[PDB]
Design a protein around this nucleic acid. Structure first.
Ligand SMILES: [Mg+2]
Ligand SMILES: [Zn+2]
Ligand SMILES: [Zn+2]
Ligand SMILES: [Zn+2]
Lengths: 1101, 901
DNA sequence: GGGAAGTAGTTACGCCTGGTCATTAC
RNA sequence: GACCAGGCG
């Protein structure tokens, strides 16, 4: 037989062979191999206005990753070099152009059209296939999984958008009317079109088309595509007698009123109202051609197929009305497809190439018109080569990848990579985001779904408004690529399916769909689906094909596109799983791998469609004859960070969510090459440790090699108030011995920029004469070349690099001091100094500062069970209680926090950790398979202690034992990066905004806090008017304004003769002074900017 | 000398005012020359102001930081229509004669409507209703009653296009466009005698001024320029829009002067009108918004005044302040409730100005000598003239000698100063209170624990702000009106809000329970720790073996109560009510019972205090907890705030000491039920699940009478849910029964300190049914929630029921159901707050101005009486006795007890 | 006239971190 | 200075 401990061996090979970032690398490889060629072949060629010239496109190739120096040479590039020098890791692109003269092709030529960024560790990157020591020699961490870009020295990652199905038909119903709306999205060359057909109280079918405001009737739009005879419409749509009667009711609006061209006249009248009569026909024909179901083609010949598809949509609409089909569910995962890098990059490349071809056309036309035909035909190769500007492609791709604003209005496609530690980066590389708007409630979209089982982690999600709309992939999830569709269609046509054109559907015949479109009918689909799936199991066809059927409507669905999310399962036949013990043995030895298991037919992938027909058993001892599949490992449905929590089934869901989210913030050894690596911020834990109680998944995924957190001796006891309300108490001697000690990094950058002309910057110790020269104390440890010596102490406002800018035009002959200095509220020691050259010849220096941080009051500590707090008091060792066996607690936690949160897993982990430490072996706590509690309690009883986990302690001050036994154990704890040293802030006086003369904003620039409106309301509610006057006016902008009393305008004061007079009216005696806030003066000025005139009436006192 | 603004009046600027107030005319569409100086005649001309240092404004002298700026004007080539007054122009045009300027009304109607407008003019809605009738009745008339003349209808198309419908023939009509040069001439002829009928004002609002002829230019200071470090200039959007307008105007003027076909000027005119319309407002209906070079739509005058970042809600209502600080908070129970701990780093940065007098010259002179780097010191000194001088290491020994009467010194914070403490969001009025400063070495704010509830704060990463008043009036207002001890009673419901929390109740129960006894050293140590002034221990209560004296907990607790207090009630620990009845009878029969008789019949469910001696009962949340406290409520209403503060401090510290040394903990064995309890729970769950399949099969075979509300299925669902809820309650009953009071979790839950019984029954028994929006789980596959169940299943466990406890673990299906149920709390807490805050904003913006006059009436600012007596008896809810105007029985009882003794 | 139907206006408060801009053809 | 993305209560 097979026990759950055996399936773990098989499950390990999946991660050992495939990895964790497959959905990026596979998609990018598919894009590289085929996407570029398809995009190039879409355009065809260039048609300039030259009388006898035309260019045809050939092949496209991608070169090696290289960089070109400004002086001309081109040399190889490596990722660390690109990161340090703030360059872009890209490779050149080559294209073949075939000149055509007078209709005869010439010999081809090859030109470079630009550069393309390269995904790290892809099939074309320089790091592909290298060994561990090769990566070590190159400065890379072998644990790095890859799958991100390097843009201008920064690391960018592309998240996956959760779009809707690309060609399916979805029906629904709204309550504001009786409309039975069926809407589809049609995709062709990146263009999205929305088409809807529906009925209403009139009973007449109506159609909505983009760029057509009026909902033209159904028969009118059908007759525009031909088949005017009334028999043709009914034959096209359906054959049910009730449907026949409904259609006879529908026809009378257009059956004997219009013909094929008359409907064209109506459409032309609507699309072009009041325009030229001939204009209307062409406009209507254009709209019909390339705005109605574009995915069926834009040629005028495809109108019959378009009419058939529209008739099918209308048939679905009317079938909803009679209650022959339940309404579709939008949140069901069979209706949603993911967007990966290979398609977003395809769209971006498409738009960039579309710009480039037009630019080339313009350049060629202008050059030929100016120079003349003799120059163009003298050397055609040179004429083609020198007319290409390869920057419009590179710059447009790079800017879009850098900013993150995709063409088409989408935002947030590209994000900065989170490099706090291992778990943060690994979880960030597996994100899934929704395109909905954040502010709206979206009650239906944020809820969990039954189809999410095995495809989406149910516990890892943000906490704010982003809850529900951002999710993470599960561990068993597998994304799919796309296979060619023509081969699949011609294979499907060869086993009994008749074409749709030859035979009309009828209620006794099954329907067959391929990727959402109808292709034919068959007399028996129950045998067809079995044959197709058996062929897939045998190995005749690819495994990306999934087949499902619904007998209520007599339909069969076949899917072969990319973007689906699938999970693996074990095939069960005749109540016996197909996996045997010898298979597990062969996998363990190494003779058999996961791919071979897939090929042999033991394990198959199921998407959301096939799972409708399945009946999955959970445990190997629960299978019977009815079951069709066996679950591999239930513990793997959780995401990556959510799998760290030991005994996750003993806690409340919000606490598990808090722990999973908080596991991405703890300090620890992130990557091995942190010393060389240049980052804006960084952290390091001095003595990381492996958790004593852990899940077996973390060992497999490599978490044990980059841990984060330490084990504490925790006693659950109520101390003297200082640990109340989620506060913790820490021992002092433990801190003095290295517990929870960490270091903080920060990098500064300076550049010797070049200006317009001979003006330039310079690295130099500033002279006392130059403007803005700081005190000579600050330039204390700068070497004469202008750079600071390493390993020298620095305080706030100290200068790291001395730079003198050219003089600012009004000050002549006076250089400006623009040195780079440490932040005003930081402190540390210089660690390393790097000198290098940028991509255009300018010098560049980078300096890092190292600071040591010891725990103090306010620092945030948190376990992995969702319990968080801050240090309340630090206690000397001799004051802490001690157990009668010789143990002194390392941490104290209030017992009031346990019952409300109901985190029993923390107590379980404490008992297990103490038992593991006593026994000298780690304890397994992997979800539903870990060691049971009673076994741990019995083992603890055997080892000599008490089964309840309690002990006897003595008071550390009085010196006598307490009246109650105290729970005590060992618990894993983590230190978050929200330290108090980065939050303290105070302001008395400082810089102000230029426009409003109010204090600036932000801790970084000595800003001030904001006194919001509810604070004003609170002050009003107390009744302190003078406090309001002081806070809102005295400590903010305040000014004196001269006001003309006779006319109400603001007077003018002249410094040249100390005379004050009103400009609009000649008044010089009634001028008075008023005290008001500057912001109100700006408001008065802005009101006077418009034609509104505010008049002021003064009063005494 | 100093005046104040009394009133503000609004109107429309005439071209004469614009041309008179302007200081320069702008003609050149450029800002800066190659050197960097402003171009003469450009949009950055020096006459309109100076920003860059080193330049002087020749209009008023001044410098780069003391010149307020001056206006400019542009002479438009041809008039254009102001977009803000677009609809009003249409309403005026379609309600007046086309060629005489008179209104479409007769004299009798004019008099009748003037007599109506005369009254009810101060109101808004009535005055707007009156105007609509005039427009509606004058729109229909097609012939002027004053002069015989035909009229034509007018069509208005957004945003600034007017159409006139004229008849070419009887059956043929063509539409004519009205260019602004005709609309202005038409509007210029309306007499001012009938303007009030249209709703305007002849003195300062004239119809012909709505069509612009000259456009003002805001000064330089209203659109600053920022110089980038790269050398390129950054300019505001208004500058770009004005440059475009000037260029278009210049081209149109040149084309007009040089002569051109009508189709050229009639297109440049439209372009200029579009540019002006976008300049005034960039979100006008039916017009493509102007787009910047980066693709972002531009910000303009209309956008600066609206939104959450506009000039009204962004700067005027709230603005950033100067003297403030921000940091994390940590608990500190050793300070009194009206104090706050301040880091020495912050205390040396914020300063409090002080004026030197004859009673503080010595301390100030001592402080100045310490300089700005030792803790007690100062940073600045102000001479009587007004000069500000910085204290330095080379100036302190001589500046401390020049100090004399009249000077000002900006010293550091000391113990005794008063500051404002705030936590955001500020939900009610108790979110801001004043505290006394107390300096601490470390770098976190220290807060007493009994002050947490009003702030709603918790020590898990929270932060708070601190503000320091600067003027003596502000300090006095904060000291008198904003003290912490003045806000013990909540104004919402007239009950205590500041009180014990968490351990302050558990320690009290441990101290005052039955059988508690203490030795001499513990009693002396706790009394010294609490701060009680005692110099002699009372008589011992009982003797242990070897003759060790012992004191009871009630005797120790009685030392904090005032001497003449007397009260009795029943707390939450009442289990058997047949034993409190005897005590109530004994109290009723004789108003002052013999203490021995009461001590013989003591019970934890009945609290009784007689002349400051606690005779029976135990401490609970009803003693001094929030919104339930009785002793605190009596103390604050009969002895004063100071006595309440002293009692609060002493009781909190005593309870903390009691809980610290006796020991208090919880473990995993606190949810260990015996075998028979588990068997009973299993049988209950079994029968509950069994009696649902019968209902399911009954519904499957008809045989079920539906409830009249909805169809049969909903009735089946309701019955199933009721059965499951009753099952969960019944299962929880036995778990409650089999856990005694000795368990620490039961102690911590039944006294209201933390948690509730539902947590206990969820931890030690089945979780129960999960639901979303009040209905069972139904999302998922067609006919089933999960793939592991047969389609079309309505069983108990197949749609959400969980038969496991948190201790016994959950199967994967139950785990998924629990996560599905738990997502709802997070989404609800994310969603509700937005509409809650919007409603609070509306309510606070509607009811802000209502005061209470000296007559007791509540009046609106205009003077309208809202209430003739606040509430209906003039009683402040904060000072009421739990809503009641006065508690009669308490007064009667206390007076009778005082006299009959 | 009283039924569409099409505008028009809103959607909690702070704080922190980092990254990008701010034209181009001749 | 304005935008974008991610976090904290
Ligand atoms: Mg909190
Ligand atoms: Zn005046
Ligand atoms: Zn000036
Ligand atoms: Zn007239």
């Amino acid at each position: 037989d097979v026990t759950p401990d055996d399936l773990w061996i098989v499950m390990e090979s999946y991660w050992q062979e495939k990895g964790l970032v497959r959905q990026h690398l596979d998609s990018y490889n598919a894009f590289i191999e085929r996407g570029l060629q398809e995009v190039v072949n879409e355009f065809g060629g260039i048609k300039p206005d030259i009388p006898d010239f035309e260019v045809k496109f050939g092949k496209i190739r991608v070169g090696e990753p290289e960089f070109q120096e400004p002086h001309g040479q081109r040399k190889p590039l490596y990722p660390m070099d690109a990161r340090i020098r703030n360059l872009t890791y890209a490779a050149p692109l080559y294209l073949e152009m075939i000149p055509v003269i007078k209709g005869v092709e010439q010999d081809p030529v090859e030109v470079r059209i630009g550069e393309l960024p390269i995904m790290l560790k892809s099939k074309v990157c320089r790091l592909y296939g290298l060994s561990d020591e090769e990566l070590i020699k190159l400065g890379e961490d072998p644990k790095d999984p890859g799958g991100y870009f390097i843009i201008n020295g920064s690391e960018r990652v592309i998240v996956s958008i959760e779009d809707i199905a690309p060609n399916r038909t979805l029906v629904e119903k709204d309550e504001r009317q009786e409309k039975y709306i069926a809407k589809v999205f049609s995709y062709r060359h990146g263009y999205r079109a929305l088409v809807a057909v529906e009925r209403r109280k009139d009973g007449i079918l109506y159609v909505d088309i983009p760029n057509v405001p009026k909902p033209v009737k159904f028969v009118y739009v059908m007759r525009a595509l031909g088949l005017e005879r009334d028999k043709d419409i009914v034959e096209a749509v359906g054959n049910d007698p009730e449907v026949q009667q409904i259609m006879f009711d529908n026809l009378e609006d257009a059956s004997d009123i219009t013909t094929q061209q008359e409907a064209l006249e109506f459409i032309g009248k609507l699309v072009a109202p009041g325009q030229a009569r001939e204009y209307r026909l062409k406009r209507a024909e254009y709209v019909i051609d390339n705005n109605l179901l574009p995915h069926m083609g834009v040629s005028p010949e495809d109108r019959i197929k378009k009419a058939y598809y529209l008739g099918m949509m209308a048939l679905k609409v009317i079938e909803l009305s009679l209650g022959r089909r339940p309404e579709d569910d939008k949140d069901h995962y069979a209706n949603k497809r993911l967007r990966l890098a290979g398609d977003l990059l395809k769209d971006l490349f498409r738009v960039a190439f579309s710009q480039l071809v037009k630019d080339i056309q313009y350049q060629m036309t202008k050059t030929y018109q100016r120079k003349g035909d003799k120059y163009t035909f003298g050397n055609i190769h040179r004429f083609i080569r020198n007319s290409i500007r390869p920057d419009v492609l590179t710059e447009r791709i790079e800017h879009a990848l850098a900013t993150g604003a995709w063409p088409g209005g989408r935002t947030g496609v590209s994000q900065l990579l989170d490099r706090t530690n291992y778990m943060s980066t690994l979880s960030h590389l597996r994100r899934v985001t929704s395109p909905l708007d954040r502010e709206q409630p979206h009650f239906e979209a944020r809820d969990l779904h039954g189809t999410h089982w095995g495809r989406i982690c149910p516990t890892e999600t943000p906490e704010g408004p982003n809850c529900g709309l951002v999710k993470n992939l599960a561990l068993m999830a597998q994304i799919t690529t796309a296979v060619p569709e023509e081969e699949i269609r011609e294979y499907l046509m060869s086993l009994g399916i008749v074409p749709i054109e030859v035979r009309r559907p009828d209620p006794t015949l099954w329907r067959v769909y391929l990727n959402g479109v109808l292709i034919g009918t068959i007399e028996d689909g129950k045998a067809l689906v079995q044959r197709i799936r058996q062929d897939r199991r045998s190995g005749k066809i690819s495994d990306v094909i999934n087949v499902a059927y619904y007998e209520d409507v007599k339909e069969v669905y076949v899917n072969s596109d990319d973007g689906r999310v699938r999970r693996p399962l074990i095939i069960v036949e005749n109540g016996v799983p197909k996996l045997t013990k010898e298979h597990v043995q062969a996998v363990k030895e190494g003779r058999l791998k996961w791919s071979d298991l897939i090929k042999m037919g033991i394990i198959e992938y199921l998407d959301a469609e096939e799972e409708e027909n399945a009946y999955v058993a959970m445990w190997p001892w629960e299978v019977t004859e009815e079951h069709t599949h066996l679950e591999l490992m239930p513990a793997a449905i959780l995401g990556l960070p959510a799998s760290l929590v030991p005994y996750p089934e003993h806690n409340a869901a919000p606490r598990n969510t808090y722990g999973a989210g908080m596991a991405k913030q703890s300090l620890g050894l992130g990557w091995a090459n942190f010393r060389i690596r240049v980052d804006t911020r960084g952290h390091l834990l001095h003595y990381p440790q492996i958790p004593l109680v852990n899940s077996r998944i973390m060992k497999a995924v490599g978490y044990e090699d980059r841990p984060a957190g330490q084990n504490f001796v925790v006693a659950v006891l109520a101390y003297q108030g200082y640990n109340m309300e989620d506060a913790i108490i820490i021992n002092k001697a433990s801190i003095e011995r290295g517990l929870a000690r960490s270091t903080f990094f920060r990098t500064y950058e300076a550049e010797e920029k070049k200006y317009l002309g001979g003006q330039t910057d310079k690295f130099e110790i500033p002279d006392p004469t130059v403007r803005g020269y700081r005190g000579e104390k600050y330039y204390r440890n700068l070497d004469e070349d202008g750079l600071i010596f390493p390993e020298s102490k620095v305080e706030g406002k100290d200068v790291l690099v001395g730079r003198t800018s050219p003089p600012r035009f009004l000050s002549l002959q006076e250089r400006r001091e623009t040195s780079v200095a440490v932040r005003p509220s930081e402190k540390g020691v210089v660690d390393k100094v790097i000198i290098t050259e940028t991509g255009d010849g300018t010098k560049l220096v980078k300096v890092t500062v190292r600071d040591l941080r010891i725990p103090e009051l306010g620092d945030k500590f948190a376990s992995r069970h969702g319990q968080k707090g801050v240090i309340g008091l630090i206690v000397p060792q001799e004051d802490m209680p001690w157990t009668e066996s010789g143990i002194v607690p390392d941490l104290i936690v209030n017992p009031h926090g346990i019952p409300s949160r109901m985190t029993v897993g923390q107590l379980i982990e404490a008992i297990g950790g103490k038992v593991a430490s006593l026994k000298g072996r780690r304890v397994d706590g992997t979800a539903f398979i870990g060691e049971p509690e009673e076994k741990l309690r019995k083992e603890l009883e055997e080892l000599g202690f008490k089964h309840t986990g309690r002990e006897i302690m003595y008071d550390g001050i009085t010196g006598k034992r307490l009246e109650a036994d105290i729970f005590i154990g060992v618990i894993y704890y983590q230190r978050l990066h929200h330290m108090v040293a980065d939050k303290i802030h105070a302001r008395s006086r400082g810089p102000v905004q230029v426009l409003t003369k109010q204090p600036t904003e932000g801790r970084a620039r000595e800003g001030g806090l904001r006194f919001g409106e509810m604070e004003r309301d609170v002050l009003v509610g107390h009744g302190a008017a003078m406090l309001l006057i002081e806070r809102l006016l005295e400590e903010s902008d305040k000014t004196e304004v001269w006001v003309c009393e006779n006319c109400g305008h603001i007077a003018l004061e002249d410094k040249r003769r100390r005379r004050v007079y009103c400009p609009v009216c000649g008044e010089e005696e009634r001028i008075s002074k008023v005290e008001m806030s500057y912001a109100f003066k700006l408001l008065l000025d802005e009101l006077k900017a418009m034609v509104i005139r505010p008049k002021l009436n003064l009063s005494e006192r | 000398m100093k005046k104040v603004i009394g009133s503000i009046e609004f109107g429309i600027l005439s071209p004469q005012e614009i041309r008179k107030m302007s200081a320069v005319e702008v003609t050149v569409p450029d800002t800066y020359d190659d050197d960097g100086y402003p171009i003469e005649g450009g949009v950055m001309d020096k006459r309109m102001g100076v920003i860059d240092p080193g330049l002087r404004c020749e209009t008023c002298g001044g410098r780069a930081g003391e010149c307020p700026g001056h206006f400019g004007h542009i002479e438009l080539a041809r008039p254009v229509i102001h977009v803000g007054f677009a609809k009003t122009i249409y309403r005026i045009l379609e309600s007046t004669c086309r060629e005489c300027g008179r209104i479409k009304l007769t004299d009798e109607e004019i008099e009748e409507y003037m007599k109506k407008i005369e009254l009810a003019r101060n109101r808004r809605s009535e005055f707007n209703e009156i105007i609509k009738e005039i427009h509606k009745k004058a729109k229909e008339r097609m012939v002027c009653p004053h002069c015989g003349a035909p009229q034509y209808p007018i069509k208005f198309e957004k945003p600034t296009i007017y159409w006139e419908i004229r008849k070419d023939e009887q059956g043929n009509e063509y539409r004519h466009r009205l260019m602004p040069t005709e609309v202005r001439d038409w509007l210029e002829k309306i007499p001012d005698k009938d303007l009030p009928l249209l709703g305007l004002d002849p003195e300062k609002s004239r119809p012909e001024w709505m069509v612009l002829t000259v456009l003002p230019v805001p000064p330089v200071t209203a659109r600053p320029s920022i110089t980038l470090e790269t050398g390129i200039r950054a300019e505001d959007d208004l500058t770009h829009k004005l440059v475009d307008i000037i260029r278009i105007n210049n081209r149109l003027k040149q084309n007009i002067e040089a002569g051109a076909p009508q189709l050229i000027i009639e297109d440049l005119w439209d372009l200029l009108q579009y540019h002006v319309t976008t300049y005034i407002n960039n979100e006008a209906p039916g017009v493509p918004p102007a787009k910047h070079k980066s693709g972002r739509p531009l910000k303009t005058l209309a956008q600066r005044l609206k939104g959450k970042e506009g000039r009204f809600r962004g700067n005027l209502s709230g603005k950033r302040v100067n003297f403030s600080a921000r940091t994390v908070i940590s608990p500190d129970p050793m300070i009194s409730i009206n104090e706050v701990g301040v880091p020495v780093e912050v205390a040396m940065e914020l300063t409090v100005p002080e004026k030197v007098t004859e009673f503080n010259i010595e301390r100030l002179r001592k402080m100045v000598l310490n300089g700005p780097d030792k803790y007690p010191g100062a940073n600045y000194v102000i001479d009587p003239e007004g000069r500000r001088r910085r204290i330095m290491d080379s100036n302190k020994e001589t500046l401390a000698n020049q100090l004399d009467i009249g000077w000002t010194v900006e010293r550091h914070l000391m113990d005794g100063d008063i500051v404002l403490f705030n936590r955001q969001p500020s939900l009610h009025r108790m979110s801001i209170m004043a505290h006394r400063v107390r300096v601490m070495p470390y770098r976190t704010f220290r807060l007493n624990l009994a002050v947490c509830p009003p702030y709603n704060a918790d020590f898990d990463g929270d932060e708070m702000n601190l503000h320091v008043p600067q003027t003596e009036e502000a300090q006095a207002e904060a000291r008198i009106l904003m003290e912490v001890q003045n806000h013990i009673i909540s104004p919402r419901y007239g009950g205590p809000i500041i009180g014990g929390i968490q351990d302050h109740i558990s320690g009290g129960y441990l101290l005052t329970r039955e059988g508690a006894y203490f030795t001499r050293d513990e009693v002396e140590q706790m009394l010294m720790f609490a701060g009680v002034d005692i110099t002699e221990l009372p008589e011992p209560d009982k003797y242990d073996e070897n003759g060790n004296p012992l004191w009871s907990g009630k005797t120790i607790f009685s030392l904090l109560l005032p001497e003449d207090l007397t009260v009795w009630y029943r707390n939450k620990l009442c289990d058997e009510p047949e034993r409190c009845e005897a005590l109530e009878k004994l109290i009723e029969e004789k108003l002052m019972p013999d203490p021995e008789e009461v001590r013989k019949l003591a019970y934890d469910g009945f609290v009784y205090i007689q002349n400051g001696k606690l005779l029976s009962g135990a401490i609970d949340k009803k003693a001094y907890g929030r919104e339930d406290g009785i002793i605190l409520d009596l103390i604050v209403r009969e002895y004063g705030v100071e006595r309440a503060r002293q009692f609060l401090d002493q009781v909190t510290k005593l309870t903390i000491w009691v809980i610290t040394h006796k020991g208090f903990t919880t473990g995993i064995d606190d949810e260990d039920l015996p075998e028979e309890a588990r068997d009973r729970i299993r049988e209950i769950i079994r029968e509950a699940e069994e009696r649902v399949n019968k209902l399911i099969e009954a519904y499957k075979r008809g045989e079920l009478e539906p409830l009249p509300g909805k169809s049969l299925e909903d009735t089946l669902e309701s019955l199933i849910m009721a059965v499951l809820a009753e099952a969960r309650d019944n299962a929880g009953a036995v778990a409650e029964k089999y856990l005694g009071m000795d368990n620490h979790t039961v102690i911590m839950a039944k006294t209201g300190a933390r948690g509730k019984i539902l947590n206990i029954t969820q931890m030690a028994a089945l979780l129960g049914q999960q639901s979303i929006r009040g209905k069972r789980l139904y999302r998922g596959f067609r006919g089933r929630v999960l793939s592991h169940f047969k389609p079309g299943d309505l069983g108990a466990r197949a749609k959400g029921f969980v038969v496991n406890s948190y201790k016994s673990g959950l199967t994967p299906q139950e785990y998924f159901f629990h996560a599905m149920g738990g997502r709802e709390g997070l989404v609800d807490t994310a969603v509700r707050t937005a509409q809650s805050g919007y409603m609070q904003r509306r309510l606070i913006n509607a009811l802000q101005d209502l005061k209470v006059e000296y007559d007791g009436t509540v009046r609106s600012p205009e003077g309208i009486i809202v209430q003739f007596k606040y509430g209906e008896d003039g009683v402040d809810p904060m000072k009421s006795w739990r809503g009641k105007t006065v508690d009669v029985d308490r007064i009667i009882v206390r007076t009778l007890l005082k006299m009959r003794g």
